[PDB]
Amino acid sequence: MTSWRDKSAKVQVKESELPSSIPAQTGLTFNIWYNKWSQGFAGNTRFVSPFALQPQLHSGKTRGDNDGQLFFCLFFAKGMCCLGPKCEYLHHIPDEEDIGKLALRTEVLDCFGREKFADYREDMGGIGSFRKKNKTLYVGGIDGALNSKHLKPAQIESRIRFVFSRLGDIDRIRYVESKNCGFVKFKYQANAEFAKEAMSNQTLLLPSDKEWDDRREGTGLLVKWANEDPDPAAQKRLQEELKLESLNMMVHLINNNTNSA
Template sequence: MSTSWKDRSAKVQVKETDLPSSIPPQTGLVFNIWYNKWSQGQSGQTRFVSPFRLDTNVHPGITLGDRQGAEFFCLYFAKGMCCLGKKCRYMHHVPEDEDALRLAAKTDVLDCFGREKFAFYRDDMGGVGSFRKRNRTLYVGGINAALANRSLKSVQIETRLRVLFSNLGELDKLRFVESKNCAFIKFKRQCNAEFAKEVISNQTLLIPSDKQWGDRLQMTGLMVKWANDDPDPRAQKAEEEEQKQESINLMTHLLEKHKKELRSELSTGLIDNNPTKKSPSRIFSNELLEKLRKRKVCVNEKSEKRQRIAPQKKPLVDYPSSPEDE
């Protein structure tokens, strides 16, 4: 995955005048209504291929949101239709490790776009998802239709899926189930699954060299939902362990990166090594550390030790609690 988005401004993906007039103006996080109407359809009607598409090589970049410390990603960006570009108050890049860790503290109630999760999945497993459990696996349906019923080999279809999804975060597993015309795509991080779900919904599996490419907008797009749990309790247990391990791996990775950065800052004299001064950048907020402690994930962050407050000494004299007591 390219990281060069940090060196450039986010591109405008679509001119405001090119957006369909039925879409309300981009005023913040109030896009659920049109999203539901637009993407999944009201009563199971055809999912037309979206005329917009995120190009991960071209579109990502720094936004106003990055400079203002935004926490969430732009849903319009994910759908390839943000007309604000660098002026957007949300982030315009594919979620990375730093984002995953920051979002980990909130991911139980909000998705990576800042939308509230609900206690239960929608009956059709669409929508934002549930806060009751973590899920990193997407179900992708309507594959033959998204290929305009071209007969491709199973391995070719899998390759196309891999190309589409691997640009949107590190994949854990990808499986195309030919007999069921669907695929399961498991990401390493939940936020990438949340992100990819929006990016790929209603996209085509055709590629420019297919002769049907020109007519793709009249065809049916992919349907992307949350995958159901594997009912096998052993699989569930393994999943739980895997997630715990993944959190640890992520933190170790970030700590190493943080240490390296600190060392280079120290060596270049950007910061002086005076322990009485405020400690330099911290990567874990107290809120997150508390959360991780609850999840029984140990964090051994050196800067934590420096921050620890000395235990309060007991007062030598016990004063009466208040003057009224006398």
């Protein structure tokens, strides 16, 4: 509105600043079918992103807004999009107005337009599932994100809270020191899908955090999906919210019978 509705979206990265489509150097000879390096051993080829999303700075109106686009630019979520106001996808954070237009389609697609799959994955990776609506994002790689300096677990919790706060309605956050894991639950599926792409392979450390010069050498903070919550308080709370949303559609499933008569 102040950020989005008045502005036009800017260009995060110029096309000459875009990274090379060739990966770095893993093996001896480059395979030109699969676009990978061959003949040797790979060396833990993950790396942190040189760019990132700036919600208030980079949002603005796009050509997807004028045409009626439902879906969001995934390169805008990564902080990489080079089209700016020419891009056919939306450059702003998903909100209650646009998510209301992602209603029939969001059952099988995500907010970027990618199909979901039946099984999840062995490591709970990229896209979601069309069987379970999972609104909670796992956070890992926090040691690799902080670039191996030490902090207190109370202060790690706040540094996770701030960068995730902009990406949508945060339901709850509970950083665990015993297992260095962040369980960040949102209000919406579409904001969990946006936040998973946006903060994947990023750095936690701030520009004043004394290692802002050296932060590119990391691995970034892993952002996968979260499993079911084993403590029995939330499971009863899961049983509660299952029952009350059921009765909400017990009302409307006898209204369209009342329309039927």
